[PDB]
Design a protein around this nucleic acid. Sequence first.
RNA 1: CACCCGUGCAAAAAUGCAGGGGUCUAAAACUGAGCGGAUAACCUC
RNA 2: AUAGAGAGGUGAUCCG
Length: 831
Amino acid sequence: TKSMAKAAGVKSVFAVGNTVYMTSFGRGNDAVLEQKIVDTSHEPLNIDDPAYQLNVVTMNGYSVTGHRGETVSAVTDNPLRRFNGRKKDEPEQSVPTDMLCLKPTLEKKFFGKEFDDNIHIQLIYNILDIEKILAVYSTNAIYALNNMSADFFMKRTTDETFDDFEKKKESTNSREKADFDAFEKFIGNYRLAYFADAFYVNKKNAKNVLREDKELYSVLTLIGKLRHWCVHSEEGRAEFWLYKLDELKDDFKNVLDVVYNRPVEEINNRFIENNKVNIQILGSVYKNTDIAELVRSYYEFLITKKYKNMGFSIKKLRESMLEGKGYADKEYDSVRNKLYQMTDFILYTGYINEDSDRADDLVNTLRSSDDKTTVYCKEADYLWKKYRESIREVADALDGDNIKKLSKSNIEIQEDKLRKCFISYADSVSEFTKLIYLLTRFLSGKEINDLVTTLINKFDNIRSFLEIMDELGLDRTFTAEYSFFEGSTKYLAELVELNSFVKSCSFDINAKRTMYRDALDILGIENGLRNFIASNVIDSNRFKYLVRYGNPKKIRETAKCKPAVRFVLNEIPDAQIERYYEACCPCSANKRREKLADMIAEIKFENFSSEAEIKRKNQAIIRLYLTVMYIMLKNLVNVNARYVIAFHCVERDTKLYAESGLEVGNIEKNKTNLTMAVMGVKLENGIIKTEFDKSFAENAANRYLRNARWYKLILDNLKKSERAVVNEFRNTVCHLNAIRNININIKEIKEVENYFALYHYLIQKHLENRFADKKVERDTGDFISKLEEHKTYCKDFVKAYCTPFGYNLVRYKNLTIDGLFDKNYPGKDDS
RNA sequence: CACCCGUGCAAAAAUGCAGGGGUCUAAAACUGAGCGGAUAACCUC
RNA sequence: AUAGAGAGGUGAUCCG
Ligand SMILES: [Mg+2]
């Protein structure tokens, strides 16, 4: 269940020295200081509108009741008593540390000094989360540019201007000429038609053509170094690269500007023309406000998407206040779409113009409160009794073409302003945001939303912590290398602006004559009907993902692996399966899937042979085959993203512990060194000769491995691991070779229980293929033998090569025990 | 059906009841996840 | 000269 303390409004419980501070929820993510406690003595800080009050205060707990929404009573634990409770021989009361014991080093890196409080560590961890998510969504981008090859993108740095790169053409060193020849080969690929916004430009003659060679190199280099910086841990001045993007060479800035300006120029030029009808009608019904200001407000409402960020579902509000009314009838379907939207502005302006005060009641009652529906019903009730006359007037203002059309050929505009208050061009947006947009040209669909939303959340959290620290009187002055975060408010605004217009995709150019072959190969076809299948397969949203992150001919072969297809169809609900079968073949639920899996695997041209039903049949078959293939590839890529997180964390924590004084060894040649440094064990003659003892458990470097049980399990697993196996596992995960060779690695599978099993079977088979020609250790040989015998992923083998993540117990258990892996498909623990 | 911590009852190294964790994990809370199911709309093939 | 289908924007709709 949700935390009762958060229901009462206790946002956070900070600790500063011998004092503990409690905060409440303000507007949005802002925080308001409420109470301060000094050893059972308390003095409230917010008096104008308290969110909660303390009833009984003891050294080991604080009791609250809350005043807003449901009066829910709750108890909060004193942060100063953490790790200092009963059975600990009554230790002193002190400020807590993070589980990795990296709080002193992390604070000394981002700030100049150690701090006696726990506010700064949360800001540092949010920055770490930003880097973590950038690693995931950057390693996927380079994979897209690697896939089209059917190396260069590694070790590509931003201190090499294209004026220098061209000199490499006649260079006598073969290792450099091969690097240049890789670039020459890359730009001639027809698959560069995909990711159009990053490599193609529009010009009059008008048609789309490739950019110049200079601009293409800048895009590849910028994305290339983003991966290298966000996966490796650079040494020297290069480690602050993302936070010092103002120092880039002129070529990289110009390409970023040109890429960023295209959508902002498209949208901002059509605003008046595309929305003229709505503006005039809204100004007719809202004539009390000046037209010049009023049209500016509508820019905030729709173009900037401000009306959806208010903290509650305005969609639900409108749905609940338009209950059972005649103007919403289907007989006005030609108006209903606009009637809702013009009602939405009437809704949005209310909580800003006049009734801004009482939006707090709605945003707080919902939080303190499933039974949350009646809150919407009550709130929607007042909405009608006030806005009935207003929205009914709009309901007839839109009536008839006499206004829905006369609003266009009137051709009257204010036209007086100099195009101000719009979305900013490239000259005003910071370089950090412009690099995010370039990264999003290569991701697809939900990934864009995930990345942008996560970035917005983390930056907002950083801003809230900074404001709290300003209120408390603490020092926040970042080090000179990290001045990037001082203006976090500015970077938040640009990302919120970006989320409004980012297209979540990049539409391909009008050169689909080349995509004909790929679209035919994805079905294994290779007259007249062929062009129809090509036209339908292309422009299907699920085909865009398949041809970017996969190879068309390889995808068809994996459709022949029956268990992989059968598992995907089981995830589709029973109602949907019935719909497909009704269209695909004009019975038992289980048997319906079996017949469907037979047809999707053996799809041929002959299967595609009045005419209306046959046209509809082929549309269903294409939609089904692409849907199944999209689901399997998406899940495998997302699972592989979980391990790039783990390896990024390993390579970051290695350097973090290096500064703390713990000897770690060279992480490159053996990736299990970090977990050996934490447990205080050292390799000797290639094996761990130190047996288990309770003394080593107590002297562990971090709190995770002070668990007596889990030290033994990890130590037992390290003995079974091998250096080469872990290195090849690292190489496979970061370059996504497990998905690149889905053609071979999935051939002999027997049963797929979840996407965890399917993913780890692909990696283990790849490891078998890689080491079949070389000597292996006895444990690896036993694991390979078990894999061959059972034809399913060996559970013990997973615990072997996932050992470099052992220093973080939670991450180790999540990435080695099935069921604890995915939060959407929970399962029982197996340890 | 993950990890850590506090508290109370039972126990010699541990069990249970009840809580907290933006400082545990992709993981604090407020717009139930939408990843499936298509309609009139301006414009495109 | 005329007739296809997916796109920024909203109803539909099932899921725990
Ligand atoms: Mg966190």
